[PDB]
Design a protein around this ligand. Sequence first.
Ligand code: A1BR4
Ligand code: ZN
Length: 139
Amino acid sequence: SGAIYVGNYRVVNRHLATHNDWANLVWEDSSRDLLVSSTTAQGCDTIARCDCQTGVYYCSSRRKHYPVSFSKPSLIFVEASEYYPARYQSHLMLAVGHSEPGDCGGILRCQHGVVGIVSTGGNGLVGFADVRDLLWLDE
Ligand SMILES: NC(=O)[C@H]1CCCN(C(=O)[C@@H](CN2CCCC2)c2ccccc2)C1
Ligand SMILES: [Zn+2]
């Protein structure tokens, strides 16, 4: 679990969005596993606007933050799960690191701010849904 809080926006994994999130919806994209809902209070996370490929992510299943190198956002095949059939997920970045179901929502950050959130994993890999292209989150 986990979310990004920027301005009057809450960014969560689409597959973990609550009933309150769908009742206050801004934008959602199944192919990216992202959902954005509106908030009454202002958030303080800063979104990174960069091409960094190194950062630190939060891993709830180890209660630890890990430094990682990650790939550029791309269309990656993701195995079928209880939330989606087998499909290509877009804007996804992979790193070598521990992740388990429950870790989705963990933030990945670089020197410029928030890069994305954990969205996939397994076999010693972790995948992050990028949010650096969503320039509208800043206005
Ligand atoms: N964005 C998605 O489509 C994800 C939705 C949740 C599930 N998902 C995953 O990758 C799982 C692993 N899979 C579950 C069934 C086959 C392996 C997982 C593992 C570790 C960390 C996080 C998630 C896919
Ligand atoms: Zn950066």
